[PDB]
Design a protein around this nucleic acid. Sequence first.
DNA 1: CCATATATGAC
DNA 2: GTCATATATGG
Lengths: 57, 58
Amino acid sequence: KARMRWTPELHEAFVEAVNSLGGSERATPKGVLKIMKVEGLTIYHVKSHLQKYRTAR
Amino acid sequence: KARMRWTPELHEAFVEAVNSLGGSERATPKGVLKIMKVEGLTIYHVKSHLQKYRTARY
DNA sequence: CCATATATGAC
DNA sequence: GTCATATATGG
């Protein structure tokens, strides 16, 4: 149990990464992670966050 | 650890329960569970499923 | 409890 | 990679 918290800064960085990869449907967890370059950030962190981002109305 | 499986029939039942209470925005986990009356079905099962249903685009 | 964020398991 | 479900958080 060491849960992660999507601070506005992190989220902002995530967004930029996703735009840079051509939006939420095109981007991939691995690709985003690669771009974000954040120490301790796992692919599973990004995989989950992206799923949610993608279904946000 | 006993992960559950939302068969189409179960889902169908879930939907009916939710409509019965006035669609996704009005319905509540406890309320749905009460209506569904399914052996082994916990409130946490329904809570999760409802969250997803509520954010389903279509 | 009701709602939401995040994690973990399953295709 | 995608998607389904569970578990943790906040009110």
